[PDB]
Symmetry: D2
Subunit: 378 residues, 4 copies
């Protein structure tokens, strides 16, 4: 994938992203000029359908792009992954929803908050939505949001969906005050008595049934990938990328500085484990995609292995960054320097629901025993 025009353009941009990393942290928001430059590489177009001028790319290319960006700036990589994957999600909505978003401008971005921090009440022609959806990474750089929650009919939940809402109908509250991923501006999308029409709503069950309405026109194999791989991989990929960036920064600084065999061992351990994380994370995605391209269903056993290795990829990345940070010692404490930033950033990314390791591990083991699984994050 390194030869792809998008990858080559991203390569040219990395020094800019590194130089801006502290400013990004300080301002608690990705700089507009970084997002513009990322847009210009074609990055956001990677998972966007061909009908909207997108690449509808091999998903490994997308995650490889994310890994690269995150290796320069953890917050920019995190935002890039999440915002970029929403272009995949929107491909599954109705054609009319896609036209609402992209009909005049195919570079329009969408942010998200998928945890149920609000709900939609059934009304004529759609839903009345209320909520305060926290943790919307990069939400200032989007003009729509996809927001997860139950549909309420006659007082009971009857579906679990994403509501697509334009920014004219919501307020962003600046609350992002955290120890890591400070640059992500993961602020809160506040929705008050908002009408959302039916065509702008997509059930996660329709997605997993392979009946999402977007599939009729967006026929590319990438859109048949399971959400339980696509979304959690978008969360792990940037953390793996952070580990690459941390590794390179550490070895560069230490190389110059260098009879300590222990520092060498930590470097060996970290580099091996980062590589293992990437091999599994990208490998499971490649295997799923190969089956789809061959017209096959992705076997449930593969979806389970994907989740198993994906949470573990995050853990390997964090363990590896921890080793390097610890080994670096006093010099790494200095504010403004890359290694301590990757460290705080990776630990912040770790909190995402999709990174909880026992959730995935317990499910995987349940499958190995042929016992029923009700968890939908797969």
């Amino acid at each position: 994938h390194d030869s792809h025009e998008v990858m080559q353009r991203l390569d040219a941009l990395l020094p800019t992203l590194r130089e801006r990393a502290q400013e990004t942290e300080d301002l608690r928001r990705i700089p507009d000029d970084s997002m513009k430059a990322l847009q210009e590489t074609g990055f956001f177009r990677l998972l966007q359908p061909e009908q909207w001028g997108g690449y509808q790319a091999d998903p490994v290319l997308f995650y490889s792009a994310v890994r690269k960006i995150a290796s320069a700036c953890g917050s920019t990589g995190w935002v890039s992954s999440i915002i970029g994957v929403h272009n995949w999600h929107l491909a599954l909505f109705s054609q009319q929803a896609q036209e609402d978003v992209w009909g005049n401008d195919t570079d329009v971005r969408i942010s998200s908050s998928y945890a149920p921090m609000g709900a939609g009440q059934v009304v004529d022609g759609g839903y009345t939505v209320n909520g305060a959806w926290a943790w919307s990474s990069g939400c200032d750089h989007a003009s729509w949001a996809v927001l997860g929650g139950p549909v309420i009919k006659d007082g009971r939940p009857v579906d679990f969906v994403s509501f697509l809402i334009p920014r004219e109908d919501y307020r962003i509250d600046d609350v992002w005050n955290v120890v890591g991923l400070r640059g992500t501006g993961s602020n809160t999308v506040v929705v008050e008595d908002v009408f959302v029409p039916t065509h702008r709503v997509l059930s996660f069950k329709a997605m997993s049934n392979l009946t999402a309405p977007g599939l009729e026109r967006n026929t590319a194999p990438v859109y048949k990938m399971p959400w339980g791989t696509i979304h959690p991989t978008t969360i792990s990929a940037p953390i793996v990328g952070m580990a690459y960036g941390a590794y390179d920064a550490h070895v560069e600084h230490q190389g110059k500085r260098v009879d300590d065999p222990f520092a060498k061992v930590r470097i060996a351990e970290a580099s091996s484990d980062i590589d293992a994380a990437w091999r599994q994370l990208s490998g499971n995605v490649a295997d799923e995609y190969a089956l789809l391209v061959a017209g096959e269903e992705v076997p449930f056993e593969l979806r389970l292995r994907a989740r198993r290795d994906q949470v573990r990829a995050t853990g390997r990345a964090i363990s590896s960054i921890d080793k390097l940070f610890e080994s670096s010692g006093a010099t790494a404490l200095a504010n403004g320097t890359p290694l301590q930033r990757f460290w705080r950033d990776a630990h912040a990314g770790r909190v995402h629901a999709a990174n909880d390791p026992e959730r995935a591990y317990v499910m995987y083991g349940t499958g190995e025993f042929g016992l029923p699984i009700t968890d939908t994050m797969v």
Copy 2:
């Protein structure tokens, strides 16, 4: 130890230290109020000689006090431990040096920087000292510094000593800009062509030979404790304390949330057990050394080796436990201004101290087990 008057007074202070932990980080040094409150508890007097109004206390009492303070505020616990132990170090200097410092005011504090970031050239009546000694925790709150470095004679190092220098003779550079232990104000003490008289310089070899001049008047057994246990334990005790604080904060917060996740329960079992193990060994080795001294017996080298082995490991267990708790807590723990992420950053910052390097102690311990020569003096 919990019933000691100093410990009871420190208990009364903890809520305040907790409340003020963020403002302490933001100030990048300990607030004046906190140092004054700590002083008024008698804490700094714990290891100070009785001749100066001190308690010359059981060293376990001192480290228990540090553990308690650090459980409320990591930066304050770190500074308290380091500044407090300098009162023990000064007890070993000449009577005249102790008089210079405490002769008019027995509450005077001393900061340090023991890494060789400067040196003293031999001259008539003393030394000419030059250096820029970084990482002097709490230096803004002291009016003297003890500074480690070689004595230079005929262009060769001939001793390794601490130079005791009053604040009138040095400049403090505000450079403290770090990810953790932010409130410690571990600034840089800059010394330029300063005369230090002979009586204000103490060799670490005299100390380890049990010939420090201060022993003649300060006869309490605590002053015969080995530096290789006293100094490194100073650096581990606050980190263990941070882990106790991190644990209490996490269980309080989580308990409320919980009132079926067996994994969160397992992490708290692992963390509480490992913190307790760290404290049992750290305090146990100190207690064992001290018991021998109280009995008029020598501290055997094997015990000094065990102390170093377990002390670096105590720091490791404390950090590993904090990591577990912080991980387990998840999203709620990222918020700026909340205790758990602060303890996490603070513990990882304390980890960088030379006396916490674990392989250094482990390799020495192993060398000892094989009956091979040891030249490392940090023991």
Copy 3:
């Protein structure tokens, strides 16, 4: 505690135990002469009541003795611990049951199997017991067994008790065929349609309620210790002792190698081998400090006429399963470091390694069981697990 007469006599015996370790494995049984020598030290009397000529000792002394024995021979240490603790358990049974066992010979030994592998049906005068109780360590060396199981009444289980049964009423089946603790002879006690009188049955609930009938005459504070600490610590202490033995064997062998090595040899300056030794010794010591520490704290409270608080019983279980874990992790580090030399059959370190991993399987070593319970306690949620 090493000035105690029992400890001094055990010290004198250790070389014999070490020399016999391979034979003990090969025969799958503790040698009769080892059990006799152990008896002659006074070891089995340590937790036995004063009325029967016993020491009714500080429990830390008992576990210290166990630690010592197990450091010489893992199987002998394992058997010694479990058989020794049965003398504590019997102190809680009725006076009449103790008289049945010790009335003519206060050196009689009892084996056990506390997992429910049989049951007792209520009948006039007691119970009809049926079972096949596996894993009865050292059962050949005992003339009674205490066997854990439910009482059946109206064809429902109504209590969980130990049935005290003499050897004339059971058969031992030799089935012990395992990868470690081979010497323990942990065979199966088979009980067929046997009458067990009321006075020879003791409920664990009665024990926990401090209403066990033996407490009336056996008033020493050690008998008020909680089973949830006493029995699991009897399982961890020998594994900790195995770790001490493994450590000493490793350092003795390696020390000779390194001192005999030449200037440029790997063995002369291997910092990694040194680090593994530091890690192992520290973690073994931590295991012992907590395991013995929690026992000491419980006992001190009892000596002071106080109850043992539940929070302490929870900490005891937490640290006890962890002590087993620390001991095994440490042996693993040493065995791995030793490398090719350690593979040789008949040598001590690989034996301690297999032995510790075998001891690990005991129900009382399952770490998540204790950890989850401890965490439940910290959250102020209800606990129903009785192994505490």
Copy 4:
């Protein structure tokens, strides 16, 4: 795919028998004759043998995949298979005349080894005088030649490190194998006393690493240009990875039955499930890196390109680590299984002992590889030849 290769299909048919006979193999303290004959029949030993001798001169990933498969059924048989099989690669680098000495009448002849220096050869006219007692020669009872590692002695000093190729008529095998794991490997001692070894039967490891080994003239297949530093240590890690796959399958089979038969501990034990997740993921990571590094090296050679030193360093890094991941994973499964797993004669405790025995091999020492890798990352000089 490798799984469709004729040798792999034939090995598949043999696995149940190898599993069944694992205990009798340990008890015999060497591989049974039947097993070696069956393995020979599959074509397995021919995998890395040159085509001029009827061999497959195969993609080395195919060879290590075969080893993984065999080792998943029987740790000792997989260990011997890997080692004996790789000697057919090593012999391909010796002179044509040496290969002719070994295979000129019977191309099924096997060679054992002991590469650690446990002997030496003194320079004499026409060759060397060799003396040694080379321990740990896995499967030596099943070979009629040995390749023995040691220095060459010239004017009383060691001038080169070579392998001496010696026929069985010239050495004695001492039955000494008495160990806690890999019991079935029969890793006995090859004793050599005042033996003449001609020049054409001696191969310098430096000649190999310089790409000047004489066997390369006729044996031109790209597999023979692979670096020894990857080839030999991978032969030591691959069977341990296979043992972990076998341990995993045995454990999940046994446990799955238990759990599905359980009623309202085995019914809902999330910890057992986590150990399964951890072990499976780490075993997979081990194999991906171990096989991936070999694949990347081989792809370069197939393309007529050089294998960069950086890749050789990564290979050693991941290879020692693969052994560690395999052992850690087996440990997890054995611990989780608990009491049931202690029974003698059952598979999981055997894989556990076997993996811990394989761990002692020089090529598995992990700090050795890790320190070397770190030295390379700093751009500092490396003198270690195991790369």
